[PDB]
Amino acid sequence: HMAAGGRKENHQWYVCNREKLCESLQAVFVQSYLDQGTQIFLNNSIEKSGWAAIQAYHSAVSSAFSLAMSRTSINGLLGRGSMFVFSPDQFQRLLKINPDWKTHRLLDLGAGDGEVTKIMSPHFEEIYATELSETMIWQLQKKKYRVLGINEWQNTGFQYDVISCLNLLDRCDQPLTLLKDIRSVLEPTRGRVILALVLPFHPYVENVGGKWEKPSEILEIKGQNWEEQVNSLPEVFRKAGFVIEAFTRLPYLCEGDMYNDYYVLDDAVFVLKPV
C-alpha cells in the first residue's frame, strides 16, 4: 500500500509512469511496495553502519587489498556489502506462488554471496549457483548451494525449474549467449526465469583493482528513462525465446558504510516464460 501523502514510503523506488509503458507491458506490471521484509533489510543495514569498528576494519582491508582483488571478492572475503532485490512476499507475488510452493531445482547464475538466493531457496529441493569470485564461491558453499562451473551448468544432463539471473546481464562478458543458454536448459512445460536488471543499462565486466572491460556482446537495451528502457526488453527477450509473464520495479538495495546507511539502484525485475 502507498498514498500520495505517506511519509518515508520512498515511492520513487516502486512507482512508474504506467502510460509510458507499451500497452502489452502495462497489462503485466505488478506494483511492489516498501514492505516488511524490505524494512528488515534496511533496519539491519542501518544497525550495521552503526558498528563503527567493523566499518573501519572493512574500509582498511578494502583500501589495502583493492589493487589485488576485485571489489566483489573483497566483499566476499569480509562477508560485507550484501544486497537485496525482493522480500519473500514480493518474490511470491511476482511468480504467483503460494508461500508453501516447492519445486525441484533452482539455478542462480552470478549468485554473489547468496543473500538474494536465500530469499528464493525455501521453494526448492536443490539449489545450484555459478560465480566468478573465489570468495563468493566460498560464501555460496557455506550456504550449501552446489556451485557449478560457468560452462558446466548447461551440460548436467538435467533441466532447471527456475533459473535466476539477477543483476548479471550488465556484468557478464556474453549476455546474449547467457540468455540463450538459460533458454536451452529451462524445463519447458513449467519452468520460469527470474531476471533483474539495473536501469539505466550500463554494462561492464569487473576486473581486479577497480578496473573493467567492455563486454563482448551487446544487449539492445535503449531508452531515455526507466519506462522506455523496459519497453525495449520484450524484443531482447524474444530474441532468446522468452516472453514476459510479469514484472515490477524494485530498489536494488545494498548494505552501507561509514558515510551512508545503505545504497540504492533501480531494478527492473521480470518473470519470463519460454515461448
Binding site: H58, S59, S62, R71, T72, N75, R80, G81, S82, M83, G112, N167, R171, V198, P200, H202, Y204, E206, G223, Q224, N225, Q229, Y252, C254, E255, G256, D257, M258, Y259, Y263, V264, L265, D266
Partner: peptide, 12 residues
Amino acid sequence: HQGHSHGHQGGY
C-alpha cells in the same frame, strides 16, 4: 567510501 556492491551507475 564503499558504495553499492554492484558498482556505480551512469545516467539515461
